[PDB]
Amino acid sequence: MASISRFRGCLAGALLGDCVGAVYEAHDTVSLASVLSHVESLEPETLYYTDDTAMTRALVQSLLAKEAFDEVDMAHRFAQEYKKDPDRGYGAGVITVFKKLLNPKCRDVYEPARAQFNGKGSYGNGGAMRVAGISLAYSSVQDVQKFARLSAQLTHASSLGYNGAILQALAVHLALQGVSSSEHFLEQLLGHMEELEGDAQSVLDAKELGMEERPYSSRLKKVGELLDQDVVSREEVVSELGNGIAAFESVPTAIYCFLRCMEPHPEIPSTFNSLQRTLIYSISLGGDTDTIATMAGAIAGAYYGMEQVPESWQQSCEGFEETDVLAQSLHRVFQES
Ligand SMILES: [Mg+2]
Ligand SMILES: [Mg+2]
């Protein structure tokens, strides 16, 4: 299929995951029944988007304005988007960065994020939730990793945070290539993370959080293991991979949802397509549902393209037309020969 369809499907998938997943954010238990009724309610209010989409748009705006990654422009756009519309459900950690970036004396736009958590940086998934645009703008894996890291570091300075951003960007990147045997898709991601998590900073950051290094790599191994199981309960998936705000407790989970939902689920009606199945499933894990779903939706939209974006769901989402234009513009500016 055509890259323009993947570009449009990628940002549509992200919007859908955020908008559809939002009502369940932070809920520790979400039944599949509940999520099915929620999505079936879109096939007779608008579903408003949250911080995930707001930041996705600001990231894309910066790339489009500059035709390149520009850290100063992007940092300022994040701050100004928050100032403009702060009630979108931003996390408590990131607001401190935005206030510091709005300081008229701020000259190093990475400094506020570095200062988070007593100089250790945040390890939340806010860098990852918005990173899809990077993978749409940059086609080399080298650039994807570099600008995924840099964009993430404007708010999430811990390697535990920015490495989750890189992982997500790489997942979206592989999906855009249409890569994909499931086995090879995982292998490649596992390979990149094994290398990135072997750097001194990665090891130091995990250690000083108490985790047994290579949190992404050990979880991507677990994803494979889970995928080799005939049946895994939702509770088992959450126990092994997580469903939280920590990037290591959401990005691998997003990836498992994507890979798992390439095949049917016995409790998800076959009337739903693969993109739909992925989002219902991911939301049914509970926890950080808007963000896990927005990330799974990004990867899935990139892989399945606009043909699996349901009209009834899409047209229920706030800003779906604006989202589509941003996707097309990224393709025009960065991907078109
Ligand atoms: Mg959100
Ligand atoms: Mg969230």
From Swiss-Prot:
Mg(2+) 2 binds at E25, D288, D290, T291. It is an enzyme of class 3 (hydrolase). Substrate binds at D51, K120, G121, S122, Y123, G124, N125, G126, H156, L209, I245. The record marks E25 as: Glutamate flap. SUPFAM superfamilies: ADP-ribosylglycohydrolase. Mg(2+) 1 binds at T50, D51, D52, D290. The keyword Metal-binding applies. Binds 2 magnesium ions per subunit. It comes from the Eukaryota. Ubiquitous. GO terms for cellular component: cytoplasm; mitochondrial matrix; mitochondrion; nuclear body; nucleus; site of DNA damage. GO terms for molecular function: ADP-ribosylserine hydrolase activity; hydrolase activity, hydrolyzing O-glycosyl compounds; magnesium ion binding; O-acetyl-ADP-ribose deacetylase activity; poly(ADP-ribose) glycohydrolase activity. The protein undergoes a dramatic conformational switch from closed to open states upon substrate-binding, which enables specific substrate recognition for the 1''-O-linkage. The glutamate flap (Glu-25) blocks substrate entrance to Mg(2+) in the unliganded closed state. In presence of substrate, Glu-25 is ejected from the active site: this closed-to-open transition significantly widens the substrate-binding channel and precisely positions the scissile 1''-O-linkage for cleavage while securing tightly 2'- and 3'-hydroxyls of ADP-ribose. Its main location: nucleus. It is found in: Nucleus; Cytoplasm; Chromosome; Mitochondrion matrix. The keyword Hydrolase applies. Pfam families: ADP_ribosyl_GH. Keywords: Chromosome, Cytoplasm, DNA damage, DNA repair, Hydrolase, Magnesium, Metal-binding, Mitochondrion, Nucleus, Phosphoprotein. GO terms for biological process: cellular response to superoxide; DNA repair; negative regulation of necroptotic process; peptidyl-serine ADP-deribosylation. Its EC number is 3.5.1.-, 3.2.1.143, 3.2.2.-. Monomer. Belongs to the ADP-ribosylglycohydrolase family. This is ADP-ribosylhydrolase ARH3. It comes from Mus musculus (Mouse). The lineage of its organism: Eukaryota, Metazoa, Chordata, Craniata, Vertebrata.
